[PDB]
């Protein structure tokens, strides 16, 4: 009801701006890579996939040549913001990951959702957490 799981279910996985569309899945992780909550649909990620993401936030652009993997699926890395946002694309779907002071906020989308909407959902939550000192 006020839990991390509620944050994911009600603030990441909500109907996007009344359009009738949703993210396919979402999660909130610590910057250390432990999951705080995820959606029932969030992919079966592996520990080294999460470490590579943590590395990409420390060494911007490391993944650009070879890709971002999550549950064995490859996303092509597109323009993000060093140490703060990682974006990726896979077909007409994608992924967006926003790092805060303490957390990383993941969003995964599939057509017809646009990358801008995923970015907007994940960044709105990420920015709120930063305001609460997280």
């Amino acid at each position: 009801s006020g839990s991390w799981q509620t944050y994911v279910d009600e603030h990441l996985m909500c109907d996007i701006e009344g359009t009738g569309q949703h993210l396919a899945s979402a999660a909130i992780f610590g910057t250390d890579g432990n999951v705080w909550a995820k959606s029932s649909s969030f992919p079966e990620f592996k520990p080294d996939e999460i470490n590579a993401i943590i590395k990409e936030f420390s060494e911007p652009g490391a993944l650009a040549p070879t890709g971002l993997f999550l549950a064995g699926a490859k996303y092509m890395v597109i323009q993000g913001e060093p140490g703060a946002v990682i974006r990726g694309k896979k077909g007409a779907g994608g992924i967006c990951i926003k790092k805060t002071g303490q957390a990383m906020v993941f969003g995964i989308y599939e057509e017809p959702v646009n990358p801008g909407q995923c970015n907007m959902v994940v960044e709105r939550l990420g920015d709120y957490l930063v305001d609460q000192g997280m």
Partner: peptide
């Protein structure tokens, strides 16, 4: 994890 802060609007 830290405790969730109050959820936003």
């Amino acid at each position: 994890p830290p405790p969730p802060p109050p959820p936003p609007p």
